[PDB]
CSV table of C-alpha atoms in Angstrom, one decimal:
chain,number,residue,atom,x,y,z
A,1,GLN,CA,-0.1,-0.1,0.0
A,2,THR,CA,1.1,3.5,0.0
A,3,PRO,CA,2.1,4.3,3.5
A,4,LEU,CA,4.8,1.7,3.8
A,5,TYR,CA,6.2,2.1,0.8
A,6,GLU,CA,6.0,6.2,1.1
A,7,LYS,CA,8.1,5.8,4.5
A,8,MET,CA,10.7,4.2,2.8
A,9,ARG,CA,10.8,6.3,-0.6
A,10,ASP,CA,11.0,9.7,1.3
A,11,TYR,CA,14.1,7.7,3.6
A,12,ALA,CA,16.1,6.1,0.4
A,13,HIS,CA,15.6,9.0,-1.9
A,14,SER,CA,17.2,11.8,0.5
A,15,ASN,CA,20.6,12.6,-0.3
A,16,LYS,CA,22.6,11.4,2.3
A,17,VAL,CA,21.6,7.8,1.9
A,18,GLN,CA,21.3,8.2,-1.8
A,19,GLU,CA,25.2,9.7,-3.0
A,20,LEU,CA,26.3,7.6,-0.1
A,21,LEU,CA,25.3,4.4,-2.2
A,22,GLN,CA,25.9,5.5,-5.7
A,23,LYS,CA,29.7,6.0,-4.9
A,24,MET,CA,30.1,2.9,-2.8
A,25,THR,CA,28.5,1.3,-5.7
A,26,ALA,CA,31.1,3.1,-7.9
A,27,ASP,CA,33.6,2.3,-6.0
A,28,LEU,CA,33.2,-1.3,-5.8
A,29,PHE,CA,32.7,-1.8,-9.5
A,30,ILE,CA,36.3,-0.1,-9.9
A,31,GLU,CA,38.0,-2.0,-8.0
A,32,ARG,CA,36.5,-5.4,-8.3
A,33,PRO,CA,37.4,-7.2,-4.9
A,34,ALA,CA,37.2,-11.0,-4.5
A,35,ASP,CA,35.3,-10.7,-1.4
A,36,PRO,CA,32.8,-7.1,-1.6
A,37,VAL,CA,31.9,-7.2,2.5
A,38,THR,CA,35.4,-6.5,4.1
A,39,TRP,CA,35.9,-4.5,1.3
A,40,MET,CA,32.8,-2.4,2.0
A,41,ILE,CA,33.9,-2.6,6.0
A,42,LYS,CA,37.2,-0.9,4.8
A,43,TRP,CA,35.9,1.4,2.5
A,44,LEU,CA,33.4,2.8,5.0
A,45,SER,CA,35.9,3.4,7.7
A,46,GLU,CA,38.1,5.2,5.6
A,47,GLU,CA,35.0,7.1,4.6
A,48,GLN,CA,33.7,7.9,8.3
A,49,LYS,CA,36.5,10.0,8.9
A,50,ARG,CA,35.7,12.1,5.8
B,1,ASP,CA,4.7,1.3,-9.8
B,2,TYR,CA,1.6,2.4,-11.8
B,3,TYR,CA,0.5,-1.2,-11.4
B,4,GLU,CA,0.8,-2.8,-8.5
B,5,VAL,CA,-0.9,0.3,-7.1
B,6,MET,CA,-3.7,-0.5,-9.0
B,7,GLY,CA,-3.1,-4.6,-7.9
B,8,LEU,CA,-3.2,-5.3,-11.3
B,9,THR,CA,-0.3,-7.4,-12.9
B,10,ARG,CA,1.5,-6.1,-15.9
B,11,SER,CA,-0.6,-8.3,-18.3
B,12,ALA,CA,-3.8,-6.8,-17.6
B,13,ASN,CA,-6.2,-6.1,-20.1
B,14,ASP,CA,-8.4,-2.9,-20.7
B,15,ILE,CA,-11.2,-4.2,-18.6
B,16,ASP,CA,-9.5,-5.3,-15.9
B,17,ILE,CA,-7.9,-2.4,-15.3
B,18,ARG,CA,-11.3,-1.1,-15.6
B,19,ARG,CA,-12.5,-2.6,-12.9
B,20,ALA,CA,-9.4,-2.4,-10.8
B,21,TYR,CA,-9.8,1.7,-10.8
B,22,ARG,CA,-13.6,1.2,-10.5
B,23,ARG,CA,-12.9,-0.4,-6.5
B,24,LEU,CA,-10.1,0.9,-5.7
B,25,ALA,CA,-11.5,4.6,-6.6
B,26,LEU,CA,-14.8,4.0,-4.8
B,27,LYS,CA,-12.5,2.6,-1.9
B,28,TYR,CA,-10.3,5.6,-1.4
B,29,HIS,CA,-12.7,8.8,-2.7
B,30,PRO,CA,-12.4,11.5,0.1
B,31,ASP,CA,-15.7,11.7,0.4
B,32,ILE,CA,-16.5,8.0,1.2
B,33,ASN,CA,-13.3,7.1,2.6
B,34,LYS,CA,-13.5,9.5,5.5
B,35,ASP,CA,-9.8,9.0,6.5
B,36,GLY,CA,-6.7,6.8,7.6
B,37,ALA,CA,-3.7,6.1,5.3
B,38,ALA,CA,-6.1,7.2,2.0
B,39,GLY,CA,-4.4,11.0,1.2
B,40,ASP,CA,-1.3,9.2,-1.2
B,41,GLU,CA,-3.5,6.1,-2.0
B,42,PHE,CA,-5.9,7.6,-4.1
B,43,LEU,CA,-3.6,10.3,-5.7
B,44,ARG,CA,-1.7,7.2,-7.5
B,45,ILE,CA,-4.2,5.4,-8.2
B,46,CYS,CA,-5.9,8.7,-10.6
B,47,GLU,CA,-1.8,8.8,-11.6
B,48,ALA,CA,-2.2,4.7,-12.5
B,49,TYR,CA,-5.7,5.0,-14.3
B,50,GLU,CA,-4.6,7.9,-16.1
B,51,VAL,CA,-1.0,6.7,-17.6
B,52,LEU,CA,-3.1,3.4,-18.3
B,53,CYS,CA,-5.9,4.3,-19.8
B,54,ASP,CA,-4.5,5.3,-22.4
B,55,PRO,CA,-2.2,3.5,-25.0
B,56,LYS,CA,0.3,6.0,-26.1
B,57,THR,CA,1.4,7.0,-22.7
B,58,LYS,CA,0.3,3.2,-21.8
B,59,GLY,CA,3.4,2.0,-24.3
B,60,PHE,CA,5.5,5.1,-23.5
B,61,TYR,CA,5.4,3.6,-19.9
B,62,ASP,CA,5.5,0.2,-20.6
B,63,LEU,CA,8.8,0.0,-22.5
B,64,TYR,CA,10.2,2.8,-19.8
C,1,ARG,CA,-0.8,-28.0,-5.2
C,2,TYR,CA,-1.6,-23.9,-5.4
C,3,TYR,CA,-0.5,-20.7,-4.6
C,4,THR,CA,-1.7,-16.6,-4.1
C,5,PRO,CA,0.4,-14.3,-6.0
C,6,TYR,CA,1.4,-12.9,-2.4
C,7,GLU,CA,3.0,-16.4,-1.7
C,8,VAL,CA,5.2,-16.3,-4.9
C,9,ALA,CA,6.3,-12.6,-3.9
C,10,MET,CA,7.7,-14.1,-1.0
C,11,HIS,CA,10.8,-15.4,-2.8
C,12,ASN,CA,12.9,-12.6,-4.6
C,13,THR,CA,16.0,-13.2,-4.2
C,14,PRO,CA,19.1,-15.2,-6.3
C,15,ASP,CA,19.1,-17.5,-3.3
C,16,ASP,CA,15.4,-18.0,-3.7
C,17,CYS,CA,13.3,-17.3,-7.3
C,18,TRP,CA,10.1,-17.6,-8.2
C,19,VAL,CA,8.5,-16.6,-11.1
C,20,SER,CA,4.7,-17.1,-12.5
C,21,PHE,CA,4.0,-17.2,-15.8
C,22,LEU,CA,1.0,-18.7,-18.0
C,23,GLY,CA,-0.8,-20.7,-14.8
C,24,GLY,CA,2.6,-21.8,-13.6
C,25,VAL,CA,4.8,-21.3,-10.3
C,26,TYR,CA,8.6,-21.8,-11.1
C,27,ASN,CA,11.3,-22.1,-9.1
C,28,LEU,CA,14.4,-20.7,-10.9
C,29,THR,CA,17.3,-20.8,-8.2
C,30,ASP,CA,19.4,-23.2,-10.3
C,31,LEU,CA,19.2,-21.5,-13.5
C,32,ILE,CA,20.4,-18.0,-11.8
C,33,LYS,CA,23.2,-20.4,-10.0
C,34,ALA,CA,24.3,-21.8,-13.0
C,35,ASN,CA,24.1,-18.6,-15.3
C,36,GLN,CA,25.3,-15.5,-13.6
C,37,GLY,CA,26.2,-13.0,-16.1
C,38,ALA,CA,24.2,-10.0,-17.6
C,39,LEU,CA,21.9,-12.7,-19.0
C,40,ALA,CA,20.7,-13.4,-15.7
C,41,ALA,CA,19.4,-9.7,-15.0
C,42,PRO,CA,16.1,-9.0,-16.7
C,43,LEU,CA,14.6,-12.4,-14.5
C,44,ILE,CA,16.1,-11.4,-11.1
C,45,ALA,CA,15.1,-7.7,-11.8
C,46,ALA,CA,11.8,-9.4,-12.3
C,47,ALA,CA,12.1,-12.1,-9.3
C,48,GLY,CA,8.8,-13.0,-7.5
C,49,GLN,CA,6.9,-11.0,-10.5
C,50,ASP,CA,4.4,-12.0,-13.0
C,51,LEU,CA,6.0,-13.0,-16.0
C,52,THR,CA,3.2,-14.1,-18.4
C,53,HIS,CA,3.4,-10.9,-20.2
C,54,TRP,CA,7.1,-12.0,-21.6
C,55,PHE,CA,4.9,-15.0,-23.6
C,56,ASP,CA,1.8,-15.7,-25.8
C,57,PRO,CA,-0.6,-18.5,-25.1
C,58,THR,CA,-0.7,-20.2,-28.6
C,59,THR,CA,3.0,-21.3,-27.9
C,60,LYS,CA,4.5,-21.4,-24.8
C,61,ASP,CA,7.6,-19.5,-26.3
C,62,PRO,CA,8.1,-15.6,-25.4
C,63,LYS,CA,6.6,-12.9,-28.1
C,64,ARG,CA,8.2,-12.8,-31.7
C,65,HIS,CA,8.2,-9.8,-34.1
C,66,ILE,CA,10.1,-9.1,-37.4
C,67,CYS,CA,13.6,-7.3,-35.8
C,68,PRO,CA,13.5,-3.8,-37.4
C,69,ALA,CA,17.0,-3.3,-38.2
C,70,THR,CA,18.0,-7.0,-39.5
C,71,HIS,CA,14.6,-8.0,-40.7
C,72,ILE,CA,14.6,-11.6,-39.1
C,73,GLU,CA,11.9,-12.6,-37.0
C,74,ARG,CA,13.1,-12.8,-33.1
C,75,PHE,CA,12.1,-13.2,-29.5
C,76,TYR,CA,9.9,-9.7,-28.6
C,77,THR,CA,12.9,-9.0,-25.4
C,78,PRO,CA,12.4,-5.5,-24.7
C,79,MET,CA,13.7,-6.1,-21.0
C,80,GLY,CA,16.9,-7.4,-22.2
C,81,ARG,CA,17.9,-10.9,-23.3
C,82,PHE,CA,17.0,-13.5,-20.8
C,83,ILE,CA,18.6,-17.1,-20.3
C,84,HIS,CA,18.0,-19.6,-23.3
C,85,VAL,CA,17.5,-16.3,-25.8
C,86,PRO,CA,20.0,-16.7,-29.3
C,87,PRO,CA,21.9,-13.3,-29.9
C,88,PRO,CA,20.9,-11.6,-32.9
C,89,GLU,CA,23.8,-12.1,-34.8
C,90,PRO,CA,26.1,-15.0,-35.4
C,91,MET,CA,28.7,-15.4,-32.3
C,92,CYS,CA,31.0,-17.8,-31.2
C,93,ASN,CA,29.9,-18.5,-27.7
C,94,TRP,CA,26.3,-19.6,-27.6
C,95,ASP,CA,26.1,-23.4,-27.6
C,96,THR,CA,22.7,-25.2,-28.5
C,97,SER,CA,24.0,-28.3,-26.8
C,98,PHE,CA,21.5,-28.1,-23.7
C,99,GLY,CA,18.2,-29.6,-24.1
C,100,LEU,CA,15.1,-27.3,-23.3
C,101,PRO,CA,14.5,-24.1,-22.5
C,102,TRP,CA,13.4,-23.1,-19.0
C,103,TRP,CA,9.8,-22.2,-20.3
C,104,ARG,CA,9.3,-25.4,-21.9
C,105,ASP,CA,11.2,-27.8,-18.5
C,106,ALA,CA,8.2,-27.8,-17.0
C,107,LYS,CA,9.2,-31.2,-15.0
C,108,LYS,CA,12.2,-29.8,-13.9
C,109,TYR,CA,11.2,-25.7,-12.9
C,110,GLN,CA,7.7,-26.0,-11.9
C,111,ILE,CA,6.4,-26.2,-8.4
C,112,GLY,CA,3.1,-26.1,-7.9
C,113,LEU,CA,0.2,-24.3,-10.1
C,114,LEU,CA,-0.9,-20.1,-9.6
C,115,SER,CA,-4.1,-19.6,-8.7
C,116,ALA,CA,-6.0,-18.0,-11.0
C,117,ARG,CA,-8.0,-15.9,-7.9
C,118,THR,CA,-8.0,-15.8,-4.4
C,119,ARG,CA,-10.8,-14.9,-2.1
C,120,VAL,CA,-10.8,-14.2,1.9
C,121,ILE,CA,-12.7,-16.6,4.4
C,122,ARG,CA,-13.4,-15.2,8.0
C,123,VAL,CA,-12.2,-17.9,10.3
C,124,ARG,CA,-13.8,-17.9,13.8
C,125,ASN,CA,-12.6,-20.3,16.2
C,126,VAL,CA,-15.7,-20.9,18.6
C,127,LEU,CA,-14.4,-22.1,21.8
C,128,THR,CA,-11.8,-19.2,22.5
C,129,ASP,CA,-13.1,-16.0,20.3
C,130,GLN,CA,-10.7,-15.3,18.0
C,131,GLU,CA,-11.6,-13.9,14.6
C,132,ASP,CA,-8.8,-14.1,11.6
C,133,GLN,CA,-9.3,-12.7,7.7
C,134,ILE,CA,-7.0,-15.0,5.6
C,135,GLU,CA,-7.3,-15.2,1.8
C,136,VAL,CA,-6.9,-18.3,0.1
C,137,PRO,CA,-7.1,-19.7,-3.8
C,138,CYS,CA,-10.8,-20.0,-4.9
C,139,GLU,CA,-10.4,-23.1,-6.1
C,140,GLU,CA,-9.3,-24.8,-3.2
C,141,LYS,CA,-10.4,-27.7,-0.8
C,142,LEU,CA,-11.2,-27.6,2.2
C,143,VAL,CA,-8.1,-30.1,3.5
C,144,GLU,CA,-5.6,-27.4,2.3
C,145,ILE,CA,-7.9,-24.6,3.8
C,146,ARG,CA,-7.0,-26.6,6.7
C,147,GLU,CA,-3.6,-26.7,5.8
C,148,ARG,CA,-3.8,-22.6,5.7
C,149,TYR,CA,-5.5,-22.3,8.9
C,150,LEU,CA,-2.3,-24.7,10.8
C,151,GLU,CA,-0.7,-21.7,11.2
C,152,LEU,CA,-2.8,-19.9,13.3
C,153,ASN,CA,-4.0,-22.9,15.1
C,154,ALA,CA,-1.7,-25.7,15.5
C,155,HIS,CA,-4.1,-28.1,17.0
C,156,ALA,CA,-6.5,-27.5,13.7
C,157,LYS,CA,-6.6,-30.7,12.8
C,158,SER,CA,-8.8,-31.8,15.8
C,159,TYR,CA,-11.3,-29.0,15.5
C,160,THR,CA,-14.4,-29.6,13.4
C,161,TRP,CA,-15.2,-26.9,11.0
C,162,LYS,CA,-19.0,-25.6,9.8
C,163,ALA,CA,-20.4,-23.4,7.3
C,164,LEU,CA,-23.8,-21.6,6.9
C,165,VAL,CA,-24.6,-23.4,4.1
C,166,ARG,CA,-28.7,-23.1,2.9
C,167,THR,CA,-33.2,-21.5,5.0
C,168,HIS,CA,-29.2,-20.9,6.2
C,169,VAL,CA,-28.4,-23.3,9.2
C,170,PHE,CA,-24.3,-23.9,10.3
C,171,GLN,CA,-23.6,-27.4,8.9
C,172,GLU,CA,-20.7,-29.4,8.3
C,173,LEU,CA,-18.2,-29.3,5.8
C,174,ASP,CA,-16.5,-32.1,3.8
C,175,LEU,CA,-13.0,-31.9,3.5
C,176,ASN,CA,-12.3,-32.7,-0.1
C,177,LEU,CA,-15.2,-30.6,-1.6
C,178,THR,CA,-13.6,-27.0,-2.4
C,179,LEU,CA,-15.6,-24.1,-1.1
C,180,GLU,CA,-17.5,-23.7,-3.8
C,181,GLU,CA,-18.9,-27.3,-3.8
C,182,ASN,CA,-19.4,-27.1,-0.1
C,183,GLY,CA,-22.0,-24.5,-0.7
C,184,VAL,CA,-19.8,-21.6,0.5
C,185,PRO,CA,-20.1,-18.7,-2.8
C,186,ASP,CA,-18.0,-16.0,-4.0
C,187,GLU,CA,-19.4,-12.8,-4.5
C,188,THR,CA,-16.9,-10.3,-4.9
C,189,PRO,CA,-17.1,-9.8,-8.4
C,190,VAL,CA,-21.0,-8.7,-7.3
C,191,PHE,CA,-19.8,-6.9,-5.3
C,192,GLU,CA,-17.7,-5.2,-7.7
C,193,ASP,CA,-20.4,-4.9,-10.1
C,194,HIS,CA,-22.8,-3.2,-8.1
C,195,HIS,CA,-20.8,-0.7,-5.9
C,196,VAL,CA,-20.6,-2.4,-2.3
C,197,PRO,CA,-17.3,-2.9,-1.0
C,198,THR,CA,-15.3,-6.3,-1.4
C,199,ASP,CA,-14.4,-6.4,2.5
C,200,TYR,CA,-18.0,-5.5,3.4
C,201,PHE,CA,-19.6,-9.0,3.6
C,202,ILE,CA,-16.9,-11.9,4.2
C,203,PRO,CA,-18.1,-15.6,4.4
C,204,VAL,CA,-17.3,-17.0,7.5
C,205,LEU,CA,-16.2,-20.3,8.8
C,206,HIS,CA,-16.8,-21.8,12.5
C,207,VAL,CA,-14.4,-24.0,13.9
C,208,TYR,CA,-15.5,-25.6,17.3
C,209,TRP,CA,-13.4,-28.0,19.4
C,210,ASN,CA,-13.8,-32.1,19.0
C,211,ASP,CA,-12.1,-33.1,22.5
C,212,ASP,CA,-9.7,-35.2,22.4
C,213,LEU,CA,-6.9,-36.9,24.9
D,1,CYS,CA,-31.9,-54.3,38.6
D,2,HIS,CA,-28.6,-54.9,40.9
D,3,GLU,CA,-28.9,-51.2,40.7
D,4,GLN,CA,-25.1,-50.7,42.1
D,5,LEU,CA,-23.7,-52.5,39.4
D,6,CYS,CA,-26.0,-50.5,37.1
D,7,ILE,CA,-24.7,-47.2,38.2
D,8,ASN,CA,-21.1,-48.3,38.4
D,9,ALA,CA,-21.0,-49.8,34.8
D,10,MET,CA,-22.8,-46.5,33.6
D,11,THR,CA,-20.0,-44.1,35.4
D,12,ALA,CA,-17.4,-46.3,33.9
D,13,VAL,CA,-19.3,-45.6,30.2
D,14,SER,CA,-19.8,-42.0,30.6
D,15,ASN,CA,-15.5,-42.0,31.7
D,16,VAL,CA,-14.7,-44.0,28.7
D,17,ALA,CA,-17.0,-42.5,26.0
D,18,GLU,CA,-15.1,-39.3,26.8
D,19,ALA,CA,-12.1,-41.1,24.4
D,20,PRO,CA,-12.5,-40.1,20.6
D,21,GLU,CA,-13.1,-43.6,19.2
D,22,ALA,CA,-14.7,-45.5,22.3
D,23,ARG,CA,-18.3,-43.8,21.2
D,24,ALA,CA,-18.1,-45.6,17.9
D,25,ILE,CA,-17.6,-49.0,19.7
D,26,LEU,CA,-20.1,-48.1,22.4
D,27,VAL,CA,-22.7,-47.3,20.4
D,28,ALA,CA,-22.0,-50.0,18.2
D,29,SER,CA,-22.4,-52.5,21.3
D,30,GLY,CA,-25.8,-50.9,21.5
D,31,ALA,CA,-25.2,-48.7,24.4
D,32,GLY,CA,-27.4,-46.1,23.1
D,33,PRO,CA,-30.9,-48.0,23.8
D,34,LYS,CA,-29.6,-49.6,27.0
D,35,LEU,CA,-29.0,-46.5,28.5
D,36,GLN,CA,-31.5,-44.6,27.1
D,37,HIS,CA,-33.8,-47.7,28.8
D,38,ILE,CA,-31.9,-47.1,32.0
D,39,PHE,CA,-32.9,-43.4,31.8
D,40,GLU,CA,-36.2,-44.0,30.9
D,41,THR,CA,-37.5,-46.2,33.5
D,42,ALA,CA,-35.8,-46.2,36.2
D,43,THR,CA,-37.1,-43.6,39.2
D,44,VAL,CA,-34.2,-43.5,41.9
D,45,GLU,CA,-32.9,-40.2,41.1
D,46,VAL,CA,-28.7,-40.6,41.1
D,47,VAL,CA,-28.9,-43.7,38.5
D,48,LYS,CA,-31.4,-40.9,36.4
D,49,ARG,CA,-29.0,-38.5,36.7
D,50,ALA,CA,-25.9,-41.0,36.0
D,51,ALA,CA,-28.1,-42.2,33.2
D,52,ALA,CA,-28.8,-38.3,32.0
D,53,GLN,CA,-24.8,-37.6,31.9
D,54,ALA,CA,-24.0,-41.0,30.5
D,55,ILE,CA,-26.4,-40.5,27.0
D,56,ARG,CA,-25.2,-36.9,27.0
D,57,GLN,CA,-21.4,-38.7,27.0
D,58,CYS,CA,-22.2,-41.1,24.4
D,59,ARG,CA,-23.2,-38.8,21.7
D,60,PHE,CA,-21.3,-36.0,21.6
D,61,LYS,CA,-18.8,-34.6,18.8
D,62,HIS,CA,-18.2,-31.0,19.3
D,63,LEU,CA,-16.8,-28.9,22.6
D,64,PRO,CA,-20.4,-27.2,23.4
D,65,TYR,CA,-22.6,-29.4,25.5
D,66,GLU,CA,-26.1,-30.2,24.4
D,67,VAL,CA,-28.4,-30.0,28.0
D,68,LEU,CA,-28.5,-33.2,29.8
D,69,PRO,CA,-31.2,-35.0,29.1
D,70,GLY,CA,-34.2,-34.3,30.8
E,1,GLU,CA,-13.1,-30.9,36.6
E,2,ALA,CA,-10.6,-33.2,34.4
E,3,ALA,CA,-12.8,-31.7,31.2
E,4,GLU,CA,-12.8,-28.2,32.7
E,5,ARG,CA,-8.9,-28.1,33.3
E,6,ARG,CA,-8.4,-29.5,29.7
E,7,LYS,CA,-10.8,-26.6,28.3
E,8,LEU,CA,-9.1,-24.0,30.2
E,9,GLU,CA,-5.6,-25.1,28.8
E,10,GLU,CA,-6.6,-24.9,25.2
E,11,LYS,CA,-8.0,-21.6,25.9
E,12,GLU,CA,-4.6,-20.6,27.1
E,13,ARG,CA,-2.7,-22.0,24.8
E,14,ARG,CA,-4.7,-20.6,22.0
E,15,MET,CA,-4.4,-17.0,23.7
E,16,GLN,CA,-0.4,-17.3,23.4
E,17,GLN,CA,-0.2,-18.9,19.9
E,18,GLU,CA,-2.1,-15.6,18.9
E,19,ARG,CA,0.3,-13.5,20.2
E,20,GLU,CA,3.5,-15.1,18.8
E,21,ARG,CA,1.9,-15.4,15.5
E,22,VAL,CA,0.9,-11.5,15.8
E,23,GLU,CA,4.9,-10.7,16.3
E,24,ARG,CA,6.3,-13.0,13.5
E,25,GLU,CA,3.8,-11.7,11.1
E,26,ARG,CA,5.1,-8.2,11.6
E,27,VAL,CA,8.3,-9.0,11.3
E,28,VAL,CA,7.9,-10.9,7.6
E,29,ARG,CA,5.5,-8.1,6.3
E,30,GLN,CA,8.3,-5.8,6.7
E,31,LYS,CA,11.0,-8.1,5.6
E,32,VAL,CA,9.2,-8.9,2.2
E,33,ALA,CA,8.3,-5.4,1.5
E,34,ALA,CA,11.9,-4.1,2.4
E,35,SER,CA,12.9,-6.6,-0.1
E,36,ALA,CA,10.7,-5.7,-3.1
E,37,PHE,CA,11.5,-1.7,-2.4
E,38,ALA,CA,15.7,-2.8,-2.5
E,39,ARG,CA,15.3,-4.8,-5.9
E,40,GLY,CA,13.4,-1.9,-7.4
E,41,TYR,CA,16.1,1.1,-5.7
E,42,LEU,CA,19.2,-1.2,-6.5
E,43,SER,CA,18.5,-1.3,-10.3
E,44,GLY,CA,17.9,2.1,-10.3
E,45,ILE,CA,21.2,2.6,-8.5
E,46,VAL,CA,23.2,0.4,-11.0
E,47,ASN,CA,21.8,1.9,-14.1
E,48,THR,CA,22.6,5.3,-13.0
E,49,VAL,CA,26.1,5.0,-11.6
E,50,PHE,CA,26.8,2.7,-14.9
E,51,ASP,CA,25.8,5.9,-17.0
F,1,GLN,CA,30.5,-2.3,-25.0
F,2,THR,CA,34.4,-2.0,-24.5
F,3,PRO,CA,35.6,-5.1,-23.0
F,4,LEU,CA,35.6,-3.3,-19.8
F,5,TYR,CA,32.4,-2.2,-19.4
F,6,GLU,CA,31.1,-5.7,-20.6
F,7,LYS,CA,33.7,-7.3,-17.5
F,8,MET,CA,31.9,-4.5,-15.1
F,9,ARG,CA,28.5,-5.4,-16.0
F,10,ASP,CA,29.7,-9.4,-15.4
F,11,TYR,CA,30.8,-8.4,-12.0
F,12,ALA,CA,27.8,-6.3,-11.4
F,13,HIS,CA,25.3,-8.7,-11.8
F,14,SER,CA,27.2,-11.2,-10.6
F,15,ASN,CA,25.3,-13.6,-7.5
F,16,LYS,CA,27.6,-12.1,-4.3
F,17,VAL,CA,27.5,-8.5,-4.9
F,18,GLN,CA,24.2,-8.3,-5.8
F,19,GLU,CA,22.7,-10.3,-3.6
F,20,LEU,CA,24.6,-8.4,-0.9
F,21,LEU,CA,23.7,-5.1,-2.0
F,22,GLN,CA,19.8,-6.1,-2.2
F,23,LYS,CA,20.4,-7.5,1.4
F,24,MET,CA,22.3,-4.6,2.7
F,25,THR,CA,20.0,-2.0,1.2
F,26,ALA,CA,16.6,-3.9,2.5
F,27,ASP,CA,17.7,-4.4,6.4
F,28,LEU,CA,18.6,-0.3,5.9
F,29,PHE,CA,15.5,0.6,4.6
F,30,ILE,CA,14.2,-1.0,7.7
F,31,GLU,CA,15.5,0.0,10.3
F,32,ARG,CA,16.4,3.6,9.1
F,33,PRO,CA,19.3,5.2,10.9
F,34,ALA,CA,19.7,8.9,11.1
F,35,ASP,CA,24.0,8.0,10.3
F,36,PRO,CA,23.4,5.0,8.0
F,37,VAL,CA,27.5,5.2,7.6
F,38,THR,CA,28.2,3.2,10.9
F,39,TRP,CA,24.9,1.3,10.8
F,40,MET,CA,26.4,-0.1,7.4
F,41,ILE,CA,29.8,-0.5,9.5
F,42,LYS,CA,28.2,-2.4,12.4
F,43,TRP,CA,25.6,-4.8,9.9
F,44,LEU,CA,28.6,-5.5,8.0
F,45,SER,CA,30.9,-6.4,10.9
F,46,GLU,CA,28.1,-8.9,12.2
F,47,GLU,CA,27.5,-10.3,8.4
F,48,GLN,CA,31.0,-10.8,8.1
F,49,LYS,CA,31.6,-13.1,11.3
F,50,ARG,CA,29.3,-15.7,9.7
């Protein structure tokens, strides 16, 4: 129904999450690691400083 | 999507869309349905039927 | 058995992918597991979705058309090229050793059968008053309605069912006859055609206890 | 006749008929008409009550319990 | 008294099953919708990041 | 459609990364943290432990 979707659409189409996810995916595709989960852990760790 | 809001599937006919909009827009109209989570629902019902009741717009949406 | 559309929707992931098309529910998980590339994208993106619009009724293969660019007849794949679809031009990697297309290999990739319609049954436990709406396929024997209701009461086998069969008196229901044979009709089409909300009246199934030990 | 024996048997039947299958055996062995006669023709109140309870206990299949005979 | 005890026991167990079912129903109802929206939004994200 | 683009599409549409992304985004739109950078770190740390 509209209420459950709207609560998630409003969250996900807000700038912080969306342009965090897009840059993360871009760098993930560029790097091409064997195991993505620890690479995302690293990337988020050295991105938390920024 | 424009389809799931009506409840129909991607292969719905024209009479199927007529019936789906009929029931969904007689269940959520402001003068009938007093209140609830029926603000966005009616607007998306109207938008979905308006998009899907005209073959040119319907097809242009279907391809994209 | 059978599946409501929502039940098919519960499995939408490359780990458990279910698709409903032409009345059949298919578990394509081993396909996506064995074919993991850009070929698997257009049906991963429609995992748990209804895939009947891809195909045509007369033949079980997807729709075909005269390709505008090459003028050679081939499958209409606006979504993209799904598994088991040949490339438009002569390549050197698309083998045809495999046996049958997945939309034709029913024995190996079909489980259950999609319900053409669903209805709302209001089950009422008469001993301990607990109303419950539920959606079940409109063509199913009471044994599997009881199986659906087994998630509401783990002891529903001992209970006895009853319905307001026709004047109208609460009478017993045979298990092997569907809800329509047993005298519980479906009137939602008439409800809609007469501008009566489909949640105004719901048929009711009383569930009494049968003492055991 | 043999009144205490009759009421003891009646209580035993009432106890056993609570089991699911037992009912079908008791109605098969003719406990129905026997208990009906015992209830109908007797005047001792305690045995009459045992008879009414036994009859109601032998013909029930649902949790709502019908009113005791008589 | 034995009959009454059994009836009350079953009443109580059904009442408890109701609450446990409600909790699990809420969890699964949210999970499935989250998965569907994740599907759609991630398809959009991958298309845009590729472009 | 250079060999890089095709290789990226093969990696992007692979099973591992795509299911991991779908799972992560579903969980994140459930919890809805006002600081997804750290919630992602904790979620990935607990996932990697398995």
